[PDB]
Design an enzyme around this catalytic site. Structure first.
Site, PDB file in Angstrom:
ATOM      1  N   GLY A  88       0.143  -1.115   7.081  1.00 51.65           N
ATOM      2  CA  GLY A  88      -1.233  -1.065   7.538  1.00 51.65           C
ATOM      3  C   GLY A  88      -2.194  -1.877   6.695  1.00 51.65           C
ATOM      4  CB  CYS A 127      -0.934   0.038   1.216  1.00 58.69           C
ATOM      5  SG  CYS A 127      -0.150  -0.294   2.809  1.00 58.69           S
ATOM      6  CB  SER A 128       0.790   4.466   1.754  1.00 59.14           C
ATOM      7  OG  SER A 128       0.485   4.138   3.092  1.00 59.14           O
TER       8      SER A 128
END
Ligand SMILES: Cc1nc(N2CCC3(CC2)CO[C@@H](C)[C@H]3N)cc(=O)n1-c1cccc(Cl)c1Cl
Length: 490
Positions: A429, A424-425
């Site tokens: 998370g 993801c980023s």
């Protein structure tokens, strides 16, 4: 190490009077906002006054206002107690907390016939648990099992804010009493030693009885999650190769770095590039048979290294769970070519065969080959989730669940396919929420509806391989909802 500076059940006013009376200049502590989840405060006393510093976590990282971004609250404090980059503010003395709610052996309001029930059925030699006194006013009772067998009960008193077992030392907190007798076991008069091997397991459940546990934790979730979060202290592994000067601008975030024991090592590098073996990515092993690689959203200077990883690790599926831009900031640069186009990313070549748009994701069939040899071409299936919100988590798991079910069947169709690349980023998370869900689901397929699942044990086993896998309680509860949804559909 420690992590006692975190106070789970105090407000903004109480944290001040604590630092103002029982602390000095340099004292600090962290605390969650009881009001709105995801917000944390860093209360530091400097020059006779307290200074509150807000920490926000929408599900991707802990954002320190006026500071940097970190994976865990432990790595945050560890970075600042050994630095200065917090303007200056000093983290000198951690003000410890006595509230034992986040301890894994403390079971609060729990009767005696329930305590013997769980210890006899699920316990083993060394299992122990602390509970409020079911006889007395506000004391506590320790219960220990020894054998392969019996259950010994040790009464703990509360005499003038101090706890004791009726003789010896008087401890200021239940933790100091427990931790002491885990170091000096109580010995009965007839040789029986009260060994505190491990706390009693209460989170391991049969996969069938998943709905009832979700029914209990919803009356629960917050207490179990913070109990797991307290164990992040034993996960402060080394991140040397990520902190090196030559690798500083290869990480999307300065202080979200891979563990040195599971980092993906880029082999067959350029002999003229002095350092080309680093990439913000970690190996993910289950029951630590399907493997993973939790990496970050590619920077413009890491695309060539990213494709080198997908090739060297023989990966065949890429799960992307972020838009290229979210909240106006960059989360991942377009590391794939346009459809029907062919691009060269250094020594690697990629062709976008076909793009398929679903309701919740886009499928990009890609052709990966290495420049030079003719037979290196392999199909890489990219599953780019698009309906993941910027804040919070999806409210219904049916969307992500159909997503992972199509990714699993694609991985199963490929022979000797490498690990599944998820990112993801920051790659901790949302990426962590996927891998944990996919790990727990992968267990249900092979063993059926009647099998053991341990959501926190799985998450802890994954966090020991990359910093801060699963970020917020929302993702933690969502995993429970995701597993529960998968089993109701059977
Ligand atoms: C997450 C977790 N929650 C446990 N409890 C639930 C909450 C209580 C205590 C018991 C009982 O009421 C509360 C006051 C809390 N005190 C016990 C436990 O073992 N885990 C765990 C499992 C695997 C790996 C790790 Cl790292 C951990 Cl921490």
């Amino acid at each position: 190490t420690s992590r006692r500076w975190f106070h789970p059940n105090i407000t903004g006013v109480e944290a001040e009077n604590l630092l103002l009376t029982r602390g000095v200049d340099g004292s600090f502590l962290a605390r969650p906002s009881k009001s709105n989840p995801g917000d944390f405060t860093l209360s530091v006393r400097r020059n006779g006054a307290v200074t509150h510093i807000k920490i926000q976590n929408t599900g991707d990282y802990y954002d320190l206002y006026g500071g940097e971004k970190f994976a865990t609250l432990a790595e945050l404090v560890q970075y600042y107690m050994e630095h200065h980059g917090q303007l200056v503010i000093e983290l000198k003395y951690p003000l410890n907390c006595a509230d034992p709610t986040s301890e894994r052996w403390f079971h609060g309001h729990l009767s005696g016939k329930e305590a013997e029930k769980l210890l006899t059925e699920k316990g083993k030699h060394g299992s122990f648990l602390v509970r409020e006194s079911q006889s007395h006013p506000g004391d506590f009772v320790l219960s220990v099992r020894t054998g392969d067998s019996k259950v010994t009960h040790v009464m703990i008193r509360c005499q003038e804010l101090k706890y004791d077992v009726g003789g010896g030392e008087r401890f200021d907190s239940l933790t100091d009493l427990v931790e002491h007798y885990k170091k000096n076991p109580m010995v009965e008069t007839l040789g029986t030693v009260l060994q505190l091997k491990q706390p009693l397991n209460t989170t391991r459940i049969n996969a069938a009885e998943i709905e009832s546990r979700v029914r209990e934790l919803s009356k629960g979730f917050w207490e179990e999650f913070e109990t797991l979060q307290q164990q992040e202290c034993k996960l402060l592994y080394s991140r040397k190769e990520g902190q090196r000067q030559e690798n500083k601008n290869k990480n999307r975030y300065k202080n979200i770095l891979p563990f040195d024991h599971t980092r993906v090592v880029l082999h067959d590098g350029d002999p003229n590039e002095p350092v080309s073996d680093y990439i913000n990515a970690n190996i993910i092993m289950p029951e630590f048979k399907k493997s993973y690689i939790a990496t970050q959203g590619c920077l413009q200077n890491t695309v060539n290294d990213f494709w080198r990883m997908v090739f060297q690790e023989n990966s065949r599926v890429i799960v992307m769970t972020t838009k290229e831009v979210e909240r106006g900031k960059s989360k991942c640069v377009k590391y794939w070519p346009d459809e029907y186009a062919l691009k060269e990313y250094g020594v690697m070549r990629v062709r976008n065969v076909k793009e398929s748009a679903a309701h919740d994701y886009t499928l990009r069939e890609l052709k990966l080959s290495k420049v030079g040899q003719g037979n290196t071409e392999r199909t890489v299936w990219q599953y780019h989730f698009r309906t993941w919100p910027d804040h919070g988590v999806p409210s219904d798991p049916g969307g992500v669940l159909d997503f992972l079910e199509e990714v699993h069947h694609k991985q199963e169709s490929i022979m000797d396919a490498g690990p599944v690349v998820v990112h993801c980023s920051a790659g901790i998370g949302r990426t962590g929420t996927f891998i944990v869900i996919d790990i727990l689901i992968d267990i249900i397929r092979e063993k059926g509806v009647d099998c053991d699942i341990d959501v926190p044990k799985t998450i802890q086993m994954v966090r020991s391989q990359r910093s801060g896998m699963v970020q917020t309680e929302a993702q933690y509860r969502f995993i429970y909802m995701a597993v529960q949804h998968y089993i109701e559909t059977l």
